[PDB]
Design a binder for this molecule. Sequence first.
Ligand code: CLA
Ligand code: CLA
Ligand code: CLA
Ligand code: CLA
Ligand code: CLA
Ligand code: CLA
Ligand code: CLA
Ligand code: CLA
Ligand SMILES: CC1=C(/C=C/C(C)=C/C=C/C(C)=C/C=C/C=C(C)/C=C/C=C(C)/C=C/C2=C(C)CCCC2(C)C)C(C)(C)CCC1
Ligand SMILES: CC1=C(/C=C/C(C)=C/C=C/C(C)=C/C=C/C=C(C)/C=C/C=C(C)/C=C/C2=C(C)CCCC2(C)C)C(C)(C)CCC1
Ligand code: SF4
Ligand code: SF4
Ligand SMILES: [Ca+2]
Ligand SMILES: [Ca+2]
Lengths: 31, 31, 80, 73, 37, 37, 141, 154, 154
Amino acid sequence: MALSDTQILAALVVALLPAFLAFRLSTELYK
Amino acid sequence: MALSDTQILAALVVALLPAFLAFRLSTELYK
Amino acid sequence: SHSVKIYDTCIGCTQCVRACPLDVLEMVPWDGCKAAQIASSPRTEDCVGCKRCETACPTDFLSIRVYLGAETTRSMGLAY
Amino acid sequence: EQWIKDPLNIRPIAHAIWDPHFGEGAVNAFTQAGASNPVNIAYSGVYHWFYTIGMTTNQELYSGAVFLLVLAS
Amino acid sequence: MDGSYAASYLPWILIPMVGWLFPAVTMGLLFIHIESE
Amino acid sequence: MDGSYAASYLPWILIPMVGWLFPAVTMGLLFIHIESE
Amino acid sequence: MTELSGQPPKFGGSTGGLLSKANREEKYAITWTSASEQVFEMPTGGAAIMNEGENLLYLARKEQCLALGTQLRTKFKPKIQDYKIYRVYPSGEVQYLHPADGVFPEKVNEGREAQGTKTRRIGQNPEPVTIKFSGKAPYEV
Amino acid sequence: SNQVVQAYNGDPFVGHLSTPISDSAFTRTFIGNLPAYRKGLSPILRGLEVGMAHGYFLIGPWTLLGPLRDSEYQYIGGLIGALALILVATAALSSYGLVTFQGEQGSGDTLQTADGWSQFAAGFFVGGMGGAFVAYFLLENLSVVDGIFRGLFN
Amino acid sequence: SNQVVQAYNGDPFVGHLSTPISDSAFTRTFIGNLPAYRKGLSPILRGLEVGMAHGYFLIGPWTLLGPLRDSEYQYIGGLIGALALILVATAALSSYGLVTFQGEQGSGDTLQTADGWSQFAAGFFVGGMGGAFVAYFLLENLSVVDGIFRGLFN
Ligand code: CLA
Ligand code: CLA
Ligand code: CLA
Ligand code: CLA
Ligand code: CLA
Ligand code: CLA
Ligand code: CLA
Ligand code: CLA
Ligand SMILES: CC1=C(/C=C/C(C)=C/C=C/C(C)=C/C=C/C=C(C)/C=C/C=C(C)/C=C/C2=C(C)CCCC2(C)C)C(C)(C)CCC1
Ligand SMILES: CC1=C(/C=C/C(C)=C/C=C/C(C)=C/C=C/C=C(C)/C=C/C=C(C)/C=C/C2=C(C)CCCC2(C)C)C(C)(C)CCC1
Ligand code: SF4
Ligand code: SF4
Ligand SMILES: [Ca+2]
Ligand SMILES: [Ca+2]
C-alpha cells in the first residue's frame, strides 16, 4: 500500500525541471 | 622423451642473433 | 601541384578556360590557328585536377592534359 | 612422438593455445588429441612430411629448427 | 589453461608481450617516426 | 540505522550530498564570485 | 591590392564557413561592387543579402570564390563583372589573385605569356623507356 | 531582437553559431571554468584535475561488468583493468605532445606547448592512477563506507 | 673509409671517440630518446618517467632476497625497503639540486637549472613511490594476475 522506488525516482525527475526553471529565473533576475 | 626448458631457452638464445642480424639488414636497407 | 600541359592542337575555342572553375587557364595570343590564340596555364598551383577542362574540348584526344602530380592543401581542395 | 605410434587414428598437433579469453567449454573442447593443455589440431602436412623424411624423435627436428635459425642468420 | 610441455612459464609472459608490449612500442615508434620532421 | 520505507538507498547518498557536496561547491562558487573583478 | 575595402553582407551565420585553416594557413576574400540590395546564395550555405556598394566576403577556398564569381556574372541581370578575389594570409599580406592581369581570362590580351605550352601532339610524346631512371616525367621531358 | 541563435563572435563567416548550447552565458562560464580551460593554472594542476575524474570512473565498468565480477577478486580486477587503460591513455597523449609541439614553440597559451603538454601528461598520469586507486579503495572497503554513512560504528 | 671508429664530433682533440657503442646511430637515437635526454618535455614528466622504472624494479631484491622472504609478510617488507630506498634517493638528488644550481641560473637546457632539477626531484619521488606500490600490488595479488593471464576466472 506504500510507495515504490519508481514513484520516488519519478518525483525526482518531475522536480528536476523546476530546478532548471528556477535556474533560468535566477539568471534573468540577476541581469 | 620430450623437450626440456634449457633447449627452449637455447633456441631463444640462438634465435636472438637473427634478430640482431635482421635489424642490421633492415637498417642498411633503409639507408 | 598538378601539371596542366596544353599542346599545339588547340584551336583557340576558349571552352576550357570558361569551363575551369579555378582561374588557372587563360588565353594568350598565338599564330598557329584561325582564332590566333591558345590557352595557357600559369596558375597551376591552384588547379585541383578536376579535369573539367578535359570535358569541353573539340579536338581528337583533347589538346589540354591534366597530369595528376603531387598534392597539397590547394590541390586536395580542403577547407580545414 | 605419439603420432608415429599410431598415425591412422591419433591427430597431429600444430601448437598450443594461450589466449586468456577461454572459458571452461573452450578449454574442455580444445584439449583434443590427448593433451592436457588446449591444443590446435594441425591440418597442414608437416607431420606426414617429417615422418616420410625419417624424423622419429622430437630432438632431431628441434635440432633442425636450430639449424634453420643459423641458416637464416 | 596450463602447459603440459616444457617451459610452461614462457608463453605466460610471451603472449602479453607480443600482444601488448610489442605492438604498443611498435606503433609508438612508428607514430613518432611517420609524423616527425 | 536503515530505512523501512521505499528507496532506502536514496538518503544514503542524498544526506552527504546536501551536507558536503552541495555546500562545498556553493561556497566555492560564491567565494570565486564575490572575490573576482 | 594590399588593403581590403568593403563591408560584410547581411548574413545570419553558418557552419560551413571559415574553419581553423583561416587563422592558421590561408583564407580568401572576394570584393565586388553591387548595384542594388539583392539576394545571393553563398557557396558556404544558404542565402545572404548583398549590401549596396562595395562589399567584402571572406571564404575558405578559392573554388568557393570562383563559384561566387560565376554566380555574380551569370545569375543577375545587372551583371557584376568587376569583382576581385584576393588571398589573405594570417601574417596580414594580401595577394591579388583574380583577375590579376586586369582583363578576364576568357578573352585574349597582350601582356600574357604562354606558360605550360607544348609544341607537339600527344601522339608525339616520348616513351618512358628512354627516361626510365632520369627522375623526370614522360610529359615534362 | 528576440532571436536566441546568432553569429559566432559577431562575424557571420566563421563556421559556427552563437547558440544557447554553444555560446550561452552558462556554457562559456562552465566550459571556460573547466580545468582544461580556466585561466591561471599550470598544466600540471589542470592535468591532475582532468586525470582524477577520469581515473575515478574507470573503475566502474570493470567492477560491475568485467570478467572478474563472478569471483571474490572483483575490485582488484577492476583496478588492474583501469590502471592498464590509464597507462595506455597517458602513453597516447604524451606521445601526442611529443610529436605535435616540435619546432616553433609558440609562447602564449602554455597548454599547447611541448613543456606544457608534458606537464599535462604528468598531471594526467598522477590524477589517473590516484583516482583509480581511490575508487578501488572506496569500493573494496564498502562495508566500512556503509558503516560510516549509516553510523553503526558508534 | 671503412673504419667504424672515428673522432668524436669531428674535432679529434675532445677526449672521446665516435664509436659503434658511443656514437652509433642506434645509440644516439636511443639514449637521445631516453626520458632524461629527449627534447620537448618538462622535467616533472621526465622525472616521473625516470622514477617509475626505478621504483618498479626495487621491489624485487627485497621480495626475493630480503630478510622477510621466510615469513608470509614477504611483499610488505619488500615494499617498505624500497620506499626507504626511494625516499633516501630523492633526498640525495633534491639536496644535490639544492646546492649545485645556486647562483647564475643559466637559461637553456632547463634540466640543469634549480627550478628544473626541483621539478625532476618531484617527478622522481612520485614515479618512485608509484612504481614501488604498483610492483608491490602486482606481486601481492599474484594469484589474481596468474588467474587473469591463464584465464581461469571465466
Ligand atoms: C575478443 C575475442 C578474442 C581475442 C582478443 C583473441 C585473442 C587471441 N587469440 Mg583467440 N579466439 C577467440 C576470440 C578471441 N581471441 C574465439 C572466439 C576463438 C574460438 C574459440 C578463438 C580461438 C583461438 C585459438 C584457437 C587460438 C587463439 C589465439 C589467440 C591469441 C593470438 C596470439 C597473438 O598475439 O598473436 C599475434 C597476433 C597476430 C599475428 C594477428 C594479427 C594480424 C595482424 C592484424 C595483421 C598484420 C598487421 C601488420 C601487417 C603488422 C602489424 C603491425 C603492428 C606491428 C604495428 C590472441 C591473444 C592463439 C593463441 O593462443 O596463441 C598461440 C590460438 O592458437 N584464439
Ligand atoms: C615465423 C614463424 C613463427 C610463427 C608464426 C610463430 C608463432 C607463434 N609463436 Mg613462435 N617461435 C618461432 C617462430 C614462429 N613462431 C621461432 C623461430 C622460435 C624460436 C626462438 C619461437 C619461439 C616461441 C616461444 C618460445 C613461444 C612462441 C609462441 C608463439 C605463439 C604466440 C606468439 C608469440 O608469443 O610469439 C613470440 C615469439 C618470439 C618472441 C620469438 C619468435 C620470433 C620469431 C623468430 C620471429 C619470426 C619472424 C617473422 C617471420 C617476422 C614476420 C614479418 C612480417 C610481419 C612482415 C605463436 C603461435 C609462444 C607460444 O607457444 O604460446 C602458446 C611461446 O611461448 N614461439
Ligand atoms: C593479442 C593479445 C591480447 C591479449 C593477451 C589480451 C588479454 C586480455 N584481454 Mg584482450 N583484446 C585484444 C587482445 C588481447 N587481449 C584485442 C585485439 C581486443 C579488441 C577486440 C581485445 C579486447 C578486450 C576486451 C573488450 C576485454 C579484454 C580483456 C582481456 C583480459 C581478460 C582478463 C582480464 O580482465 O584481465 C585484467 C586486465 C589486465 C591483465 C590488464 C593488464 C594490466 C597489467 C597486469 C599491468 C602491468 C603493467 C605494468 C605496470 C608494466 C610492466 C612493464 C613491463 C616492461 C614489464 C586479458 C588480460 C577483458 C578485460 O577485462 O581486460 C581489461 C575485456 O573486457 N580484451
Ligand atoms: C522545501 C521543502 C523541503 C524540505 C524542507 C525538505 C527537507 C528534507 N528532505 Mg526533501 N524533498 C522535497 C522538499 C523538501 N525536502 C521535494 C519537493 C522532493 C521531491 C523531489 C524531496 C525529495 C527528497 C528525497 C528523495 C529525500 C529528501 C530528504 C530530505 C531531508 C534531508 C535533506 C536532503 O537530502 O534533501 C535533498 C533534497 C533534494 C535533493 C530534492 C529536494 C529539493 C527541493 C525540491 C528544493 C526545495 C527548495 C527550497 C525551498 C529552497 C530554499 C531556499 C532558501 C535557502 C532561500 C530533509 C528533511 C532525504 C531524506 O529523507 O533523508 C532522510 C531524501 O532521501 N527529500
Ligand atoms: C550536515 C551534514 C553532515 C554529515 C552528513 C556528516 C557526516 C559525518 N560526520 Mg560530521 N559534521 C558536520 C556535518 C555533517 N557531518 C558539521 C556541520 C560539523 C561541525 C559541527 C561536523 C563535525 C564533525 C566532527 C567533529 C566529526 C564528524 C564526523 C562525521 C562522520 C561520522 C563517521 C565517520 O568517521 O566518517 C568517516 C569519514 C568520512 C566518511 C569522510 C568522507 C570521505 C568520503 C568517504 C570520501 C569520498 C570522496 C570521493 C573521492 C569524492 C567523490 C566525488 C563525488 C562527486 C561522488 C560522518 C561521515 C566524525 C568523523 O570522524 O568524520 C571524519 C567526527 O569526528 N563530523
Ligand atoms: C561495442 C559493443 C560492445 C559492448 C557494449 C561491450 C560490452 C562489454 N564487453 Mg565486449 N566486445 C565487443 C563489443 C562490445 N562489448 C567486441 C566487438 C569484442 C570483440 C569480439 C568484445 C570482446 C569482449 C571480451 C573478450 C570481453 C568483453 C567484455 C565486456 C563487458 C565488460 C567490458 C568492460 O568493462 O568495458 C570497459 C569499457 C569502458 C571502460 C568504457 C566505458 C565507456 C563509458 C561508459 C562511456 C560513458 C559516456 C557517458 C555516459 C556520456 C556522458 C559523459 C558526461 C557528459 C556526463 C561489457 C558488458 C568482458 C566480459 O566479461 O563480458 C561480460 C570480456 O571478457 N568484450
Ligand atoms: C629501455 C628504456 C626505457 C624504459 C625502461 C622506459 C620505461 C617507461 N616508459 Mg619509456 N621511452 C623510451 C625508453 C624507455 N622507457 C624511449 C627510448 C622513448 C622514446 C620513443 C620512450 C617514450 C615514452 C613515452 C612517450 C612514454 C613512456 C612511458 C614509460 C613508462 C610506462 C609505460 C611503458 O613504457 O611501459 C613499459 C615498457 C617498457 C619498459 C618497454 C620499453 C620499450 C620501449 C623503448 C618503450 C617505448 C614506450 C612506448 C612508446 C609506449 C609504451 C607504453 C605501453 C606499455 C602502452 C615506463 C617507466 C610512458 C609514461 O608513463 O610516461 C609518463 C609514456 O607516456 N616512454
Ligand atoms: C657486496 C656484496 C654483497 C651482496 C651481493 C649482498 C647481498 C645480499 N645481502 Mg648483504 N651485506 C654485505 C654485502 C653484500 N650483500 C655487507 C658487506 C654487509 C655488512 C657486513 C651486508 C649485510 C647484510 C645484512 C645485514 C643483510 C644482508 C642481506 C642481503 C640479501 C638481500 C639484500 C638486498 O635486498 O639487497 C638490495 C639490493 C639492491 C636493491 C640493489 C640491487 C642492485 C641491482 C641488482 C643492480 C642491477 C644492475 C643491472 C643488472 C645492470 C644492467 C642495467 C640495465 C642496463 C639493464 C642479499 C643476498 C639481507 C638478508 O636477508 O640476507 C639474505 C640482510 O638482512 N646483507
Ligand atoms: C553535476 C553536473 C555535471 C557533472 C557530472 C559528472 C559527470 C560528474 C563527474 C564526477 C566525477 C567523475 C567525480 C570524480 C571525482 C574524483 C576525485 C575526487 C578523485 C580524487 C582522487 C584522489 C583523492 C587521489 C589521490 C591520490 C592518491 C590516493 C595516491 C596517488 C596520488 C593521488 C595524490 C592522486 C554535468 C557535467 C553533467 C553538467 C552539470 C551538472
Ligand atoms: C628492451 C631493451 C632494454 C630495456 C630493458 C629494461 C631494463 C627494461 C626495464 C623495464 C622496466 C623497469 C619497466 C618498468 C615499468 C614501470 C612502470 C610501468 C611503472 C608504472 C607505475 C605506475 C603505474 C604507478 C602509478 C601511480 C600510482 C599507482 C599511485 C602513486 C602515483 C602514481 C601515479 C605514480 C635495453 C635497455 C636493455 C636495451 C634494448 C632492449
Ligand atoms: S578547349 Fe581545347 S581547343 Fe579550346 S582553347 Fe582549350 S585547349 Fe584549345
Ligand atoms: S583540372 Fe580543373 S582546375 Fe585544372 S585546368 Fe582542368 S578544369 Fe581547370
Ligand atoms: Ca567472472
Ligand atoms: Ca626471513
